[PDB]
Amino acid sequence: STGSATTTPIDSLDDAYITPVQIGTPAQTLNLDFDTGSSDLWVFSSETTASEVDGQTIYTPSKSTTAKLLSGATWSISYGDGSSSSGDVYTDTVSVGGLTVTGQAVESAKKVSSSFTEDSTIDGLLGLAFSTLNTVSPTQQKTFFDNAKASLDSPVFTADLGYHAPGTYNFGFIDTTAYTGSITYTAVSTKQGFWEWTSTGYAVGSGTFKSTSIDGIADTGTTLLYLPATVVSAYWAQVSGAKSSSSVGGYVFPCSATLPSFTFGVGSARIVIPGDYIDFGPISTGSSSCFGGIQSSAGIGINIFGDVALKAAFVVFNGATTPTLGFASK
Numbered sequence: 001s002t003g004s005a006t007t008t009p010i011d012s013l014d015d016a017y018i019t020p021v022q023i024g025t026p027a028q029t030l031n032l033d034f035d036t037g038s039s040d041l042w043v044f045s046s047e048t049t050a051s052e053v054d055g056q057t058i059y060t061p062s063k064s065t066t067a068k069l070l071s072g073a074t075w076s077i078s079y080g081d082g083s084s085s086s087g088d089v090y091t092d093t094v095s096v097g098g099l100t101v102t103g104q105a106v107e108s109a110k111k112v113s114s115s116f117t118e119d120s121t122i123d124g125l126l127g128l129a130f131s132t133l134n135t136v137s138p139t140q141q142k143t144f145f146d147n148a149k150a151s152l153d154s155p156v157f158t159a160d161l162g163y164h165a166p167g168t169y170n171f172g173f174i175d176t177t178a179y180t181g182s183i184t185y186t187a188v189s190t191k192q193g194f195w196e197w198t199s200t201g202y203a204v205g206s207g208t209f210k211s212t213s214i215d216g217i218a219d220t221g222t223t224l225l226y227l228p229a230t231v232v233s234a235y236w237a238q239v240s241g242a243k244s245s246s247s248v249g250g251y252v253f254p255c256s257a258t259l260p261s262f263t264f265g266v267g268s269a270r271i272v273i274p275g276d277y278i279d280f281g282p283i284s285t286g287s288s289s290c291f292g293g294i295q296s297s298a299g300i301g302i303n304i305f306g307d308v309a310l311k312a313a314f315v316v317f318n319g320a321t322t323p324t325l326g327f328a329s330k
């Protein structure tokens with residue numbers, strides 16, 4: 001089996017990407033945020049506190065002939081940005097891009113934080129990290145990928161995120177037309193439940209490459225690139241007028257700037273993030289201060305290769321017995 005679905009940025013900044021997912025019988029299509037940094041498939045639902053729903057499409061299990069309550073199961077999750085949701089659990093048929101899983105745990109939100117309510121374009125999350133992070137209690141549940149894995153032609157999925165454009169999530173195959181050159185694979189640690197890997201270093205613009213190990217996670221659910229303070233200072237030092245603002249909550253730069261590229265290492269290979277990708281536009285509407293797409297991971301406790309980095313590459317999430325990540329230019 002394979003699946004292939006288009007993923008679409010939610011706004012002009014590429015703040016997140018949504019992918020249509022069919023749930024239930026007859027199908028209920030919800031637009032979910034595919035998140036390689038978490039392991040819960042949760043949705044806005046007919047159970048979500050009415051005051052916390054603002055435009056989202058909801059899943060109504062009572063309208064699905066295949067929905068089953070997973071009796072006694074609850075879930076509760078918190079994300080690195082302070083958002084959260086919780087609720088109860090159904091099993092149902094879930095399809096992504098033509099790939100179907102029966103008996104998938106669909107976590108129905110009773111509560112979501114304000115950040116989810118205020119984002120009308122995201123109907124829930126589909127976690128793609130390791131199932132050891134799944135929050136369902138008392139019986140932990142598997143991710144859509146882990147349930148699909150044995151059926152897939154190859155135990156892989158790929159992320160091909162667009163810059164200000166749609167992209168693709170594929171399951172079970174590697175589209176050799178979707179990238180240039182070769183794919184460089186690198187080791188993954190599953191010890192923290194993430195797609196955790198070690199970059200071999202970085203360069204700023206046309207500068208020399210600095211060989212240095214940077215542990216971090218490949219996270220499609222995080223917008224920006226979060227790296228050590230040393231690395232981030234070295235990047236923004238090349239932008240006249242850039243500074244870290246405690247009032248705004250990170251590095252800002254004059255909107256009149258042209259940003260340098262940022263290169264990160266994958267083994268002996270190099271992925272170049274164009275400078276344009278690092279522009280997140282005015283900090284408030286009409287401002288001449290712009291928000292940076294490379295920020296410090298200080299305080300977060302992990303480095304995060306979020307969408308700013310991942311969208312510069314074709315990314316293979318290899319879920320074989322020994323997991324690996326692959327990166328190619330595109």
Ligand SMILES: NCCc1ccc(S(=O)(=O)F)cc1
Nearest residue numbers: 035037079083115116221222
């Ligand atoms: N891996 C990060 C998952 C995540 C965490 C928070 C959101 S948000 O829409 O509330 F900003 C979205 C996705």
